[PDB]
Amino acid sequence: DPKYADLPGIARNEPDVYETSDLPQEELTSTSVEHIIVNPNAAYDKFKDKRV
């Protein structure tokens, strides 16, 4: 802005930025699989005792 006033070869009424418009897995449930979860803390403390 002050430099815009300084030099003569400077145009005015310039919205310098012009942008466009702006607006705003499934097989874990598969029937044939025997999908298992673990809770590793429990089984870990369980098998943890296996001093092998």
């Binding site: 897995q25 097989e27 044939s32 699989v33 025997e34 673990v38 590793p40 870990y44």
Partner: protein, 370 residues
């Protein structure tokens, strides 16, 4: 010295990281090995100019991505060197190998020079007090809590079933197969050129694999569904480009059981699993029928297990109860089973001291892995 044990998931497809006790792998990222495709002149580019991590995870078409793990077997150790340097990054760990008990994993049947070379790095550059390079299906045994069982794995160019029983020396019955989604997605690039889709780059391959993981199902009937009329699902690219599919989305995973599509002479990992069954015994076979584990990130598909179960039924004996247990997060489950074993303190026998590695190395590897 017993600090927190490092859990090194040696993910060929997607490498994972963190320590034991962590119920989630803290750092997770694939086999990508980049450095810029172009050459920066003006400053503004990042520093290191060999990027792996968020920089690579945000600049795909900018870095020349490469892969040393030919069938999950790294050839450019230099890549791993920088990867392991990045393991202690300011974003990552900022610690020492010296400062921690470390644990490694390994898909069996790899050439001895691989794990020997890796151990050279971790006991020369890095200096681990005690370490061991375990297997990979045991992780899944922890995740399932089982001891008896067939464990299928899935990296990126490696997939195989691992028939186990309480951790017993059955290496003949135990199998290993190095083939997976790497060339399946490359075959998808073949499909692309088959119908004029101009795609050849590695970053372009990453995009292809993302959509592959996204838009690829598994029709249970092979040719009965392969010879149908396809809708050619117009996938709109992340850029926005509309791209159809065809039956190719399920055709490419058939290659994993139809190796003749690429011309490879193989059987289908389920048939190799049946061969492992044959290598086992009638009493133990039934257990394996009841105990099957699918793991590895490449196993993630739509209509995946149902189709493969049907194919097994096509090749299974008379009414034997086929049963496949499954971890929901096949990627996580592995690293987490490794987290369990790392948190398992019976590892005292199972580790390898630094001094021992200096004395024997290969002999210490075999004698401690057997």
């Amino acid at each position: 010295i017993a600090n927190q044990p490092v859990v090194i998931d040696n993910g060929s497809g997607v490498i994972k990281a963190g320590f034991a006790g962590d119920q989630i792998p803290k750092y997770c990222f694939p086999n990508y090995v980049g450095r810029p495709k172009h050459v920066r002149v003006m400053a503004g580019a990042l520093e290191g100019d060999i990027f792996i991590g968020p920089k690579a995870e945000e600049h795909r078409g900018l870095l020349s991505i490469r892969y040393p793990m030919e069938h999950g077997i790294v050839k450019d150790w230099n890549d791993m060197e920088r990867i392991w340097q990045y393991v202690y990054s300011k974003d990552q760990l900022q610690t020492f190998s010296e400062e921690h008990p470390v644990l490694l994993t390994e898909a069996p049947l790899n050439p001895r020079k691989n794990r020997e070379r890796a151990a050279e790095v971790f006991f020369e550059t890095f200096n681990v007090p005690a370490l061991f390079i375990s297997m990979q299906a045991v992780l899944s045994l922890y995740a399932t809590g089982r001891t008896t069982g067939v464990v299928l794995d899935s990296g990126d160019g490696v997939t195989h079933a691992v028939p186990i029983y309480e951790g017993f020396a059955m290496p003949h019955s135990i199998m290993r197969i190095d083939i997976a989604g790497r060339d399946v997605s490359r075959f998808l690039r073949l499909y692309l050129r088959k119908e004029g889709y101009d795609f050849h780059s590695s970053s372009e391959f990453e995009i292809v694999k993302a959509i592959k993981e996204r838009a690829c199902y598994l029709s249970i009937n092979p040719q009965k569904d392969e010879t149908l009329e396809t809708e050619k699902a117009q996938y709109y690219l992340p850029d926005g480009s509309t791209i159809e599919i065809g039956p190719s989305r399920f055709r490419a995973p058939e290659l994993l059981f139809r190796p003749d599509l690429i011309g490879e002479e193989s059987e289908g990992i389920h048939e190799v699993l049946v061969f492992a069954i044959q290598k086992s015994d009638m009493d133990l076979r039934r257990t394996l029928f009841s105990n099957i584990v699918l793991s590895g990130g490449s196993t993630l598909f739509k209509g995946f297990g149902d189709r493969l179960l049907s194919e097994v039924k096509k090749l299974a004996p008379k009414d034997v109860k086929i049963r496949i247990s499954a971890p929901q997060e096949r990627l996580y489950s592995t690293w987490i089973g490794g987290s369990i074993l790392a948190s398992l303190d019976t590892f005292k026998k199972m580790w390898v001291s630094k001094k021992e590695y200096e004395e024997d190395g290969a002999r210490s590897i075999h004698r401690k892995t057997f």
